[PDB]
């Protein structure tokens, strides 16, 4: 910090050498330097940011998942928090902003314990006994998912994931959208285990009216253009057959080995005809099957387009692999990589075709999308987001994509807990009484671990531009009485948090904000494992590139 | 198509010259240029205001909360911002009080004018609007005045004067800082009650000497003055009573030298023998002459010779150096002596009266003190200001200059004419000026209306700097004035104001018992010069610069 140290005094290293508490301080400032951009983005009162690529292109982002991934940091201690933000996005899909703030403060608050001659091995042991004591307390304080006669849960779960976004005001409209979407795309596996594939719904970057008037599609929407303009755009009537092909349909040569060498020039035209005829024989049998709509991964040559225009078939080129599996899964068809069977003959059976009620091509602001609705075998869903431009919709795309992961977890695990820093404030009262029981040096480690957990409710008040100590002191007073509740419900002074729009402490159950408990579990372990990785480093050895 | 003609007939003037007309939103930019440094001033207005590190070219640093002081060092490019610098500089020179009011008011008049020019009001009508508002504003300041001092010297009355002034600059503790000024003001004033003489007071009388070390509680009020000098011959505690005499000479205490080629000339050995002792004798004679008058300390104006020093410390005459004009003039006002450049006998009527001259260790260096006693009082007293950081000595010293400048406000007008502080004087004008807009017809009513909206910045600033939410504190205070004067006499809703610390809701428990007020003479010229700052910026529609 003060000055640079001596460069390899009687050590003979080609790179730099540093040791002592200086690098330990640099890791604290390194974790705090990357955490300051994540501070202002926490909670509903947080504001978004924009990252410029020095080419005019920019992107608005609130969550710290892709922000830190875009920020190219060269200090390796900061890379662990960069990967921690990417790690938490894969498993849980929510809380990337919280693990960076929690992990940075655990290292910041533990920095005072380093110069007290407390070893890091004793500090992490005091943190770990506080962790498993906190997980059991989280397993005690969790609540059931019924709570009333009706459901009255999944609409409130979406508000927590939808908060701190541009469309947080429209969360009342989008709350019904996300719950209706994920309940349509469920599946069955492992003999009774229900799964919810995230990203299976199609998020379209449309422009137009507003985010409030975003129409939920009762079915999947394919984002691709029509091949020819003389084709029929709208296909009505029930039982519309869907054909999902992947083989190469354009005219292609024979295989590498085959070299056509001709001596009698009479058959030179005939081999040209059958190469043009062998590709049309495949199109002939599809017309015999009567597939109104056909989708192909590869291209479609003009030799095939004339047959679809004549027979009124909807041929669409330039499909992708991951989409057609969901079309076949939704419409009831099966993926056809090639047309063949166990016998030597070559034919096409009608069982390979799907079924749907209606298929309509729609265009909105230079975005052609094929709306497939009314799948008979299994339902599907897609969300047409509408906003200002593509870069504003990227925040909405990440906002919706994080919302599916949160609603995924509350259905896979019915246990939930309230937001507003409730469990973060409850663990402090639980760990203070436990810190005195253990006696020896781990009291300060467990105590400072509890003090670091309070940063989540404190940051909600700092970013709100209000008085923070009054809200924290009132939240401390109610949680202080929860441990001394004196059971005989009348077990009140629990499940309360901050209300930032009004600045009062009210019940989070009635306010309608919840979060699954599994997100709290994985975030605490991943935050502490990152804290263990930084505390145990003593000396750096940076080797210059050759 | 590939390149424009790049403004033809541009060679009329130089390439460095640029024009800036009212169009293209440039008047909005000039308001935005004011908004850059105006937001710096908001965080510096009031008792909770924050000082500013304004390092400069040299490296010489000053930490401060005054608008006029901070703007001296900053080199400004925008000319419209320099109008505020010289407007606050005029405020500091004349009255020495209310510079932040000039900066924050004139900046907000340009802020609300951003809405007026955008609506479509002509610039000529805008100046007529504020001028008609100014005549009504200065009229009502004389009407809603309450209280008066009526006594030049009093222990309790000065606490009402100095304390609200220094509360902005380095608040700290109230009593220890206010007593140093109220004690020093009573020493220098010519009281002379029941004589009919005209009062007189000088800003240069009270001066603060900065000494490092100690603490703010150890500061004392010295009757006389002090320098960081060393006696040459000997030091003396001077435990002898029966007061000494003082003789001031502006010329150096030494043998006469003419001016045109002073060179020795010795034709023979008889002159060589007598030229060396002639001097001793002559100097000795002049010095003995000086002493038969009973003088024991002489303040010299320039360098003193060694031969003259040998005869001065023979009889125990102290020597003091004052190598400057103003340092020598300030000392004569204490003892009341009349200097004469001649080396002869001081006149007995012109000899000064000083009882004791002590030399003690305060800041580790040698200092000479001239404390008088209750008998034979003197003027131009000093204040020993002790502190740890030299930067804090600079800002506290200028706070005494602001307090001494506030004492000047009592001499020229007929009396004190105090006003209620803590935003009460600003919030009262909002209702009076708003009613004045309803009485006058014409398109100037919007200019009168926005002039009242500009006065909300004083309560809004004090509520923001106090760590309170302005959305709840401001309209709670309007309820005291929305219940306007009923049929009962002696209404006490005028003393309601903001509060920095304490009760909720905030309507302060009067500014009364609190003993905080404002001066009428400060508010008169502040609103006058602030309106002139907005007048000159809004009246100009084209700006021309050079080299940048």
């Amino acid at each position: 910090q003060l000055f640079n140290n001596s460069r390899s005094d009687t050590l003979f290293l080609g790179g730099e050498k540093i040791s002592g508490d200086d690098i330990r301080n640099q890791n604290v400032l390194a974790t705090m330097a990357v955490a300051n951009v994540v501070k202002s983005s926490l909670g509903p009162v947080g504001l978004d940011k924009m990252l410029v690529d020095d080419i005019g292109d920019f992107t608005v982002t609130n969550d710290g998942a892709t922000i830190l991934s875009l920020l190219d940091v060269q200090h390796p201690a900061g890379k662990i928090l960069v990967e921690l933000a990417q790690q938490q996005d894969r498993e849980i899909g929510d809380g990337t902003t919280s693990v960076v703030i929690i992990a940075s403060e655990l290292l910041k608050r533990a920095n005072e314990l380093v110069k007290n001659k407390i070893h890091p091995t004793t500090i992490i042991t005091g943190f770990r006994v506080a962790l498993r004591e906190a997980i059991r307390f989280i397993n005690e304080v969790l609540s059931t998912s019924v709570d009333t006669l009706g459901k009255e849960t999944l609409i409130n779960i979406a508000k927590t994931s939808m908060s701190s976004k541009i469309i947080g005001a429209d969360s009342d409209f989008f709350s019904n959208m996300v719950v209706d979407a994920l309940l349509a795309v469920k599946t069955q596996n492992s003999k009774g285990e229900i799964k919810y594939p995230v990203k299976a719904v199609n998020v379209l970057k449309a422009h137009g009216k507003s985010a409030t008037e975003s129409l939920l599609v009762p079915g999947y929407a394919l984002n691709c253009t029509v091949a020819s303009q003389a084709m029929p755009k709208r296909i009505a009537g029930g039982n519309v057959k869907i054909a999902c092909l992947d083989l190469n349909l354009q005219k292609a040569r024979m295989a590498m080995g085959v070299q056509i060498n001709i001596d009698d020039p009479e058959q030179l035209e005939q081999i040209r005809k059958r190469e043009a005829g062998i590709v049309l024989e495949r199109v002939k049998k599809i017309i015999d099957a009567g597939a109104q709509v056909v989708l192909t991964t590869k291209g479609i040559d003009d030799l095939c387009l004339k047959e679809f225009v004549e027979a009124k078939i909807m041929g669409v080129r330039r499909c992708k692999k991951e989409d057609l599996r969901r079309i076949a899964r939704a419409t009831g068809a099966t993926l056809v990589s090639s047309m063949s069977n166990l016998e030597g003959e070559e034919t096409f059976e009608s069982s390979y075709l799907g079924l749907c009620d209606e298929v309509v091509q729609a265009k909105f602001s230079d975005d052609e999308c094929i709306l497939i609705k009314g799948t008979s075998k299994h339902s599907s869903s897609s969300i047409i987001l509408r906003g200002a431009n593509d870069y504003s919709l990227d925040e909405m795309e990440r906002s919706l994509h994080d919302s599916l992961s949160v609603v995924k977890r509350t259905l896979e695990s019915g246990n939930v807990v309230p937001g507003g820093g409730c469990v973060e404030a409850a663990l402090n009262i639980y760990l203070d009484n436990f810190a005195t029981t253990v006696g020896s040096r781990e009291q300060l480690a467990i105590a400072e671990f509890a003090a670091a957990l309070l940063i989540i409710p404190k940051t909600l008040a700092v970013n709100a531009a209000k008085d923070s100590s009054e809200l924290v002191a009132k939240l401390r007073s109610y949680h202080a009485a929860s441990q001394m509740a004196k059971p005989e419900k009348r077990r009140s002074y629990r499940n309360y948090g901050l209300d930032l729009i009004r600045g009062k402490i009210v019940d989070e159950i009635h306010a309608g904000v919840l979060e699954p408990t599994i997100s709290k579990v994985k975030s605490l372990k991943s935050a502490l494992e990152a804290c263990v990785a930084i505390l145990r480093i003593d000396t750096m050895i940076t080797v210059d590139p050759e | 198509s590939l390149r424009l003609p790049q403004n033809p007939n541009a060679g009329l003037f130089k390439q460095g010259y640029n024009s800036y007309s009212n169009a293209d939103g440039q008047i909005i930019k000039s308001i935005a240029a004011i908004r850059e440094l105006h937001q710096m001033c908001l965080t510096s207005m009031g008792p909770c205001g924050r000082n500013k590190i304004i390092v400069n070219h040299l490296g010489k640093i000053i930490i401060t909360n005054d608008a006029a002081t901070m703007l001296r060092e900053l080199d400004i490019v925008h000319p419209a911002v320099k109008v505020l610098v010289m407007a606050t500089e005029q405020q500091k020179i004349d009255m020495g009080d209310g510079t932040n009011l000039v900066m924050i008011l004139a900046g907000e008049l340009l802020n609300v004018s951003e809405k007026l020019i955008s609506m479509g009001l002509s610039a000529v009508e805008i100046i007529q609007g504020y001028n008609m508002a100014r005549k009504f504003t200065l009229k009502e300041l004389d009407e809603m005045v309450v209280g008066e001092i009526t006594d030049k010297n009093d222990k309790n009355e000065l606490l009402k004067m100095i304390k609200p002034v220094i509360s902005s600059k380095k608040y700290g503790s109230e009593d220890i800082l206010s007593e140093l000024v109220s004690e020093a003001v009573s020493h220098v004033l010519p009281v002379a009650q029941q004589a009919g003489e005209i009062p007189y007071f000088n800003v240069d009388s009270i001066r603060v000497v900065k000494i490092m070390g100690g603490s703010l509680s150890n500061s004392t009020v010295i009757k006389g003055m002090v320098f960081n000098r060393e006696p040459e011959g000997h030091v003396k505690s001077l435990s002898e009573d029966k007061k000494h005499k003082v003789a001031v000479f502006t010329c150096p205490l030494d043998i006469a030298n003419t001016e045109t080629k002073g060179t020795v000339l010795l034709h023979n050995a008889q002159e060589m023998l007598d030229f060396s002792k002639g001097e001793e004798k002559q100097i000795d004679a002049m010095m003995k002459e000086i002493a038969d008058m009973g003088v024991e300390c002489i303040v010299a104006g320039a360098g003193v010779g060694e031969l003259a020093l040998h005869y001065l410390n023979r009889y125990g005459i102290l020597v003091l150096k004052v190598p400057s004009k103003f340092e020598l003039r300030r000392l004569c006002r204490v003892c009341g002596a009349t200097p004469l450049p001649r080396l002869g006998a001081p006149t007995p009527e012109e000899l000064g009266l000083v009882e004791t001259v002590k030399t003690m260790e305060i800041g580790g260096d040698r200092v000479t003190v001239f404390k008088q006693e209750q008998g034979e009082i003197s003027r131009t007293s000093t204040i020993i200001l002790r502190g740890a950081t030299q930067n804090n000595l600079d800002d506290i010293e200028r706070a005494i200059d602001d307090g001494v400048a506030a004492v000047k406000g009592l001499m020229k007008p007929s009396g004190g004419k105090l006003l209620p502080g803590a935003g009460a004087t600003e919030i009262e004008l909002i209702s009076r000026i708003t009613k004045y807009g309803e009485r006058t017809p014409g398109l100037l009513q919007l200019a009168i209306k926005q002039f009242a909206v500009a006065f909300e910045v004083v309560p809004r600033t004090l509520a923001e700097t106090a760590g309170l939410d302005v959305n709840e504190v401001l309209p709670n205070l309007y309820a005291a004035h929305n219940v306007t004067e009923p049929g009962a006499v002696k209404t006490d809703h005028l003393y309601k104001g903001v509060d920095i610390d304490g009760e909720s809701d905030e309507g302060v428990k009067d500014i009364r018992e609190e003993n905080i007020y404002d001066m009428l003479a400060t508010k008169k010229f502040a609103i006058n010069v602030a309106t002139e700052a907005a007048t000159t910026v809004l009246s100009i529609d084209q700006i021309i610069m050079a080299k940048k």
Partner: protein, 520 residues
């Protein structure tokens, strides 16, 4: 309109810093914490020293806040507040500079988390300014009104954390006698002026009842004079004793050649007349600020009269108060009564440098010891250590106040602040308790440098204040904690009051700042 560019008018100069934020102030705190880290391990007797070499290649070794900070040209504006309080503490008291700086730092760290929460600034300053008023009053109760038992113990603690602490058995015996020569209400610091002698060992020093000044010039008749006078008599001069122009001019007209011989003999006549008046009064020692020529020193060399010159005015003022004479800038007004006397005179070889020793006076106002050492930093460290200790025993004579050292003052003040905070609100509470545990940084780092664990120490201090009413502190010898009154470790209270007032003024100065402007 006059140009196609139309440049946008910037408010400030290019390269003039712009500074708005909740941070900005955090950088000033981290800047102070950075400077505070360098002075951190230098606390207490078991600390360390700091080696600095500036651009001019001047080596220095010091543990004082002041010297170290100075040998450092600090350009950061907020960090120079620590430089000012160190010079302010060094100028008046001369001890515990470091302490003040470590206190400031901790107050600032506590202030930092509080600022990471909206708690604003005037609220933090009101807590320290209201708490420091009780700390000053509490220290007055911790201090004693001691008058019995008639200096020795206070000097041993002021010499800590530097060289001569281990040699306190020899230096404190003669250092106490330095201030006893000075009478009340004068306390002249220039009389304790001590010089440098490169060469020798510190153990061979001795106490001197007078002055010892370098001649700085080799005269032609220096060896002829005797070095030993049984009953010497000192007379201070100021006239220049050599053949030159009389009074700032030189112009002599001579017409006749017979008078040209007489005017030269007159100059030779008056110069011996000037010297004969010095000879007739019996002045054995002659001293003058101005130079002395070869003509005068050889005239004095014949009849056993020592002379010297090339001395400063500060040295001359120390000679008068030692011998008790006066200054006479004229040879005709010399009388016998104004001549100073002493016991004996002897010029001794000291580090290849000659010094004129005076000693054995019945009443001497001067104490001046010769500092001999190996390196130039050894003699410098012995000077600064004595200069810091001499100020403590100097001001101990001004007032008799004694408080317990070893970090005992901070713990007793912190306990009452915790009781005072336990009675008040919310905002202020947290602030006063934050000031309480932040005030305990002095015994915190004092034991970390000793190698002991801080948890076992700090847990023992708090729970044992009931029987350890006021004199409860750390003991390094027995590796235990006990009463400091039995160990005879004492320290005045003036270091504690000025430390808290300077530290409270330092932290409150920049806590009322949220801006940073840097032109050019």
């Amino acid at each position: 309109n006059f140009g196609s560019q139309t440049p946008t008018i910037v408010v400030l100069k290019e390269g003039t810093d712009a500074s708005q934020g909740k941070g900005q102030i955090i950088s000033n705190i981290n800047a102070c914490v950075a400077v505070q880290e360098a002075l951190k391990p230098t606390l207490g007797p078991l600390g360390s020293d700091i080696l600095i070499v500036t651009s001019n290649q001047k080596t220095t070794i010091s543990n004082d806040g002041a010297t170290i900070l100075k040998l450092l040209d600090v350009v950061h504006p907020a960090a120079k507040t620590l430089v000012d309080i160190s010079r302010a503490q060094d100028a008046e008291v001369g001890d515990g500079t470091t302490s003040v700086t470590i206190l400031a730092g901790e107050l600032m760290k506590e202030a930092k988390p509080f600022l990471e929460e909206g708690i604003s600034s005037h609220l933090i300053m009101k807590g320290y300014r209201k708490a420091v008023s009780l700390a000053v009053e509490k220290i007055n109760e911790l201090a004693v009104d001691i008058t019995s038992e008639k200096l020795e113990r206070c000097a041993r603690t002021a010499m800590s954390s530097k060289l001569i602490h281990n040699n306190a058995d020899f230096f404190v015996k003669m250092c106490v006698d330095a201030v006893l020569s000075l009478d009340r209400n004068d306390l002249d610091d220039k009389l304790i002026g001590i010089k440098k002698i490169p060469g020798g060992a510190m153990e061979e020093s001795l106490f001197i009842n007078g002055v010892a000044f370098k001649k700085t010039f080799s005269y032609a008749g220096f060896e002829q004079q005797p070095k030993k006078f049984n009953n010497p008599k000192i007379l201070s001069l100021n006239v220049e004793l050599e053949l030159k122009a009389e009074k700032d001019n030189a112009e002599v007209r001579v017409e006749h050649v017979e008078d040209y011989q007489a005017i030269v003999d007159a100059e030779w006549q008056l110069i011996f007349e000037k010297l004969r008046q010095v000879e007739e009064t019996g002045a054995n020692i002659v001293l003058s600020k101005l130079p002395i020529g070869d003509l005068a020193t050889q005239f004095f060399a014949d009849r056993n009269i020592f002379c010297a010159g090339r001395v400063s005015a500060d040295d001359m003022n120390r000679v008068i108060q030692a011998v008790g004479g006066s200054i006479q800038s004229t040879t005709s007004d010399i009388k016998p009564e104004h001549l100073g006397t002493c016991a004996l005179f002897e010029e001794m070889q000291i580090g290849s440098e000659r010094y004129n020793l005076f000693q054995g006076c019945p009443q001497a106002k001067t104490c001046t010891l010769l500092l001999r050492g190996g390196a130039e930093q050894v003699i410098a460290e012995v000077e600064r250590s004595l200069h810091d200790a001499i100020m403590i025993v100097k001001r101990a004579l001004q007032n008799k106040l004694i408080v317990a050292g070893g970090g005992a003052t901070e713990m007793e003040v912190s306990k009452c602040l915790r009781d005072y905070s336990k009675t008040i609100a919310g905002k202020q509470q947290m602030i006063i308790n934050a000031f309480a545990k932040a005030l305990e940084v002095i015994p915190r780092q004092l034991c970390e440098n000793a190698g002991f664990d801080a948890i076992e120490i700090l847990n023992k201090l708090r729970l044992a204040h009931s029987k350890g009413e006021k004199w409860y502190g750390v003991v390094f010898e027995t590796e235990n904690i006990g009463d400091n009154f039995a160990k005879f470790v004492w320290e005045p209270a003036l270091v504690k009051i000025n430390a808290l007032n300077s530290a409270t003024e330092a932290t409150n100065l920049i806590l009322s700042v949220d801006e940073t402007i840097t032109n050019k």
